[PDB]
Design an enzyme around this catalytic site. Structure first.
Site, short mmCIF file in Angstrom:
data_model
loop_
_atom_site.label_atom_id
_atom_site.label_comp_id
_atom_site.label_asym_id
_atom_site.label_seq_id
_atom_site.Cartn_x
_atom_site.Cartn_y
_atom_site.Cartn_z
N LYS A 131 -32.87 -31.37 -33.98
CA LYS A 131 -33.22 -30.43 -32.92
C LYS A 131 -34.63 -30.67 -32.37
O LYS A 131 -34.82 -30.74 -31.15
CB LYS A 131 -33.12 -28.98 -33.42
CG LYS A 131 -31.71 -28.52 -33.73
CD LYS A 131 -31.64 -26.99 -33.84
CE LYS A 131 -32.35 -26.45 -35.08
NZ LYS A 131 -31.50 -26.56 -36.29
N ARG A 133 -28.94 -18.20 -34.84
CA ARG A 133 -28.50 -18.88 -36.05
C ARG A 133 -27.40 -18.07 -36.72
O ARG A 133 -26.83 -18.48 -37.73
CB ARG A 133 -29.70 -19.08 -36.99
CG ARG A 133 -29.50 -20.17 -38.03
CD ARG A 133 -30.78 -20.45 -38.80
NE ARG A 133 -31.80 -21.10 -37.98
CZ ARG A 133 -32.23 -22.35 -38.17
NH1 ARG A 133 -31.72 -23.10 -39.14
NH2 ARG A 133 -33.19 -22.84 -37.40
N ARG A 162 -38.57 -36.93 -44.25
CA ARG A 162 -39.32 -36.49 -43.08
C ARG A 162 -40.80 -36.28 -43.34
O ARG A 162 -41.20 -35.72 -44.36
CB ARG A 162 -38.74 -35.19 -42.51
CG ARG A 162 -39.54 -34.63 -41.35
CD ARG A 162 -38.82 -33.52 -40.58
NE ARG A 162 -38.60 -32.31 -41.38
CZ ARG A 162 -38.18 -31.16 -40.88
NH1 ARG A 162 -37.95 -31.04 -39.57
NH2 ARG A 162 -38.01 -30.11 -41.67
N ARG A 213 -42.97 -31.05 -45.16
CA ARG A 213 -42.77 -29.61 -45.10
C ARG A 213 -42.37 -29.08 -46.47
O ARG A 213 -41.58 -29.68 -47.18
CB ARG A 213 -41.72 -29.27 -44.04
CG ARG A 213 -42.17 -28.14 -43.12
CD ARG A 213 -41.25 -27.96 -41.93
NE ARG A 213 -39.96 -27.41 -42.32
CZ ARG A 213 -38.94 -27.26 -41.47
NH1 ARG A 213 -39.07 -27.63 -40.20
NH2 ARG A 213 -37.80 -26.74 -41.90
N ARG A 249 -30.73 -24.61 -47.83
CA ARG A 249 -30.70 -24.47 -46.38
C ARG A 249 -29.37 -24.96 -45.84
O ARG A 249 -28.78 -24.35 -44.94
CB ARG A 249 -31.86 -25.26 -45.76
CG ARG A 249 -33.23 -24.69 -46.09
CD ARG A 249 -34.33 -25.73 -45.93
NE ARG A 249 -34.30 -26.35 -44.62
CZ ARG A 249 -35.02 -27.41 -44.28
NH1 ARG A 249 -35.82 -27.98 -45.18
NH2 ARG A 249 -34.93 -27.91 -43.06
N1 LIG Z 1 -31.02 -39.80 -34.48
C1 LIG Z 1 -31.73 -39.87 -35.62
N2 LIG Z 1 -31.49 -40.87 -36.55
C2 LIG Z 1 -32.17 -40.99 -37.72
N3 LIG Z 1 -33.15 -40.10 -38.03
C3 LIG Z 1 -33.46 -39.07 -37.17
C4 LIG Z 1 -32.75 -38.96 -35.98
N4 LIG Z 1 -33.18 -37.92 -35.28
C5 LIG Z 1 -34.15 -37.38 -36.03
N5 LIG Z 1 -34.33 -38.06 -37.18
C6 LIG Z 1 -35.29 -37.80 -38.30
O1 LIG Z 1 -34.71 -36.75 -39.10
C7 LIG Z 1 -35.70 -35.83 -39.59
C8 LIG Z 1 -35.36 -34.43 -39.11
O2 LIG Z 1 -35.40 -34.39 -37.65
P1 LIG Z 1 -35.96 -33.14 -36.80
O3 LIG Z 1 -35.87 -33.39 -35.34
O4 LIG Z 1 -37.26 -32.82 -37.44
O5 LIG Z 1 -34.88 -32.05 -37.18
P2 LIG Z 1 -34.53 -30.54 -37.00
O6 LIG Z 1 -33.09 -30.40 -36.67
O7 LIG Z 1 -35.44 -30.11 -35.94
O8 LIG Z 1 -34.81 -30.09 -38.46
P3 LIG Z 1 -35.41 -28.79 -39.04
O9 LIG Z 1 -35.66 -28.95 -40.49
O10 LIG Z 1 -36.72 -28.61 -38.46
O11 LIG Z 1 -34.43 -27.68 -38.76
P4 LIG Z 1 -34.12 -26.38 -39.47
O12 LIG Z 1 -33.06 -25.67 -38.73
O13 LIG Z 1 -33.67 -26.68 -40.83
O14 LIG Z 1 -35.28 -25.47 -39.76
P5 LIG Z 1 -36.22 -24.75 -38.83
O15 LIG Z 1 -37.57 -25.29 -38.73
O16 LIG Z 1 -35.66 -24.46 -37.50
O17 LIG Z 1 -36.30 -23.31 -39.59
C9 LIG Z 1 -36.96 -23.28 -40.89
C10 LIG Z 1 -36.59 -21.98 -41.56
O18 LIG Z 1 -36.94 -20.91 -40.67
C11 LIG Z 1 -36.05 -19.79 -40.78
N6 LIG Z 1 -35.39 -19.58 -39.46
C12 LIG Z 1 -35.55 -20.31 -38.32
N7 LIG Z 1 -34.79 -19.80 -37.35
C13 LIG Z 1 -34.17 -18.76 -37.88
C14 LIG Z 1 -33.26 -17.88 -37.27
N8 LIG Z 1 -32.83 -17.93 -36.01
N9 LIG Z 1 -32.77 -16.87 -38.07
C15 LIG Z 1 -33.12 -16.70 -39.37
N10 LIG Z 1 -33.99 -17.55 -39.94
C16 LIG Z 1 -34.53 -18.59 -39.23
C17 LIG Z 1 -35.06 -20.22 -41.86
O19 LIG Z 1 -35.53 -19.80 -43.16
C18 LIG Z 1 -35.11 -21.76 -41.81
O20 LIG Z 1 -34.67 -22.44 -42.96
C19 LIG Z 1 -37.03 -36.37 -39.07
O21 LIG Z 1 -37.68 -37.05 -40.16
C20 LIG Z 1 -36.63 -37.27 -37.89
O22 LIG Z 1 -37.60 -38.29 -37.70
MG LIG Z 2 -37.37 -28.49 -36.00
#
Ligand SMILES: Nc1ncnc2c1ncn2[C@@H]1O[C@H](COP(=O)(O)OP(=O)(O)OP(=O)(O)OP(=O)(O)OP(=O)(O)OC[C@H]2O[C@@H](n3cnc4c(N)ncnc43)[C@H](O)[C@@H]2O)[C@@H](O)[C@H]1O
Ligand SMILES: [Mg+2]
Ligand SMILES: [Zn+2]
Length: 215
Positions: free
Chosen positions: A13, A88, A127, A160, A171
């Site tokens: 994302k 989510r 990551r 992270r 997660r």
């Molecule tokens: N095509 C490709 N090929 C190979 N490698 C690739 C690639 N594309 C990318 N990569 C690599 O892959 C890795 C990941 O890519 P990256 O682009 O960093 O991935 P991401 O999908 O953005 O991953 P996140 O961990 O940030 O998502 P998340 O939903 O788990 O947690 P979030 O921060 O939103 O939320 C964190 C926490 O917040 C809380 N939270 C957030 N939103 C809510 C909500 N709406 N409701 C309730 N709780 C919430 C929850 O506790 C949650 O766990 C990188 O190293 C990148 O370089």
């Molecule tokens: Mg993210």
């Protein structure tokens, strides 16, 4: 251009979003980033969300919906926005429907970046994130030119806190239970778009960009 990005933890994302906002100049709104920013500034919101985030659990709907509603009302969302990681839960989705209906900015596309759960553990444990700009790298798939530092600003990279085996597994478990209901919800709405996120980053973005023309 009103967009929502969804996908399992690590699907890409943030990586795809970064590219979307550069080409279209719409605000990138990540609830994950918002919670962590709060955790750093140590606001009451940040402290409350921390307990859930550290365990890999979802922060409660009420407080989450609240910060998004306020964010979407800002002047910078005039021409559109990119929601990342929200909604989510079906409850969040229903609340957002009401929120956007009041703001007069209905969703154009809900882009689901599909990645097999079996490869996400490797994506997250490997990551590395820039402490300065937040852009992400991967030790194997998208490494920085110089280990431990950001190509752009030279800031130190970090891992992270929730990107450890135990929390990642949690997660994945927690978010797996939300995927299908969310997909069915938007598929019913008529604007769900699925993208194969298991390809090179620019190949994935090509498909994403194909959906944005004319918005
Ligand atoms: N095509 C490709 N090929 C190979 N490698 C690739 C690639 N594309 C990318 N990569 C690599 O892959 C890795 C990941 O890519 P990256 O682009 O960093 O991935 P991401 O999908 O953005 O991953 P996140 O961990 O940030 O998502 P998340 O939903 O788990 O947690 P979030 O921060 O939103 O939320 C964190 C926490 O917040 C809380 N939270 C957030 N939103 C809510 C909500 N709406 N409701 C309730 N709780 C919430 C929850 O506790 C949650 O766990 C990188 O190293 C990148 O370089
Ligand atoms: Mg993210
Ligand atoms: Zn940086």
């Amino acid at each position: 251009m009103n967009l929502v990005l969804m996908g399992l933890p690590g699907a890409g994302k943030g990586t795809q979003g970064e590219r979307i906002v550069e080409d279209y100049g719409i605000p990138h709104i990540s609830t994950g980033d918002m919670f962590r920013a709060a955790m750093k500034e140590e606001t009451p919101l940040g402290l409350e969300a921390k307990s859930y985030i550290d365990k890999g659990e979802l922060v409660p709907d009420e407080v989450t919906i609240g910060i998004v509603k306020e964010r979407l009302g800002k002047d910078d969302c005039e021409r559109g926005f990119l929601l990342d990681g929200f909604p989510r839960t079906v409850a969040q989705a229903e609340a957002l429907e009401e929120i956007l209906e009041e703001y007069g900015k209905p969703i154009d596309y809900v882009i689901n970046i599909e990645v097999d759960k079996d490869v996400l553990m490797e994506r997250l444990t490997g990551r590395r994130i820039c402490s300065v700009c937040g852009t992400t790298y991967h030790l194997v798939f998208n490494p920085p030119k110089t280990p431990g530092i950001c190509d752009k600003d030279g800031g130190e990279l970090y891992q992270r806190a929730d990107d450890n085996e135990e929390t990642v597994s949690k997660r994945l478990e927690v978010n797996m239970k939300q995927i299908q209901p969310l997909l069915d919800f938007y598929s019913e709405k008529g604007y769900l778009a699925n993208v194969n996120g298991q390809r090179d980053i620019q190949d994935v973005y090509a498909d994403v960009k194909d959906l944005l023309g004319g918005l």
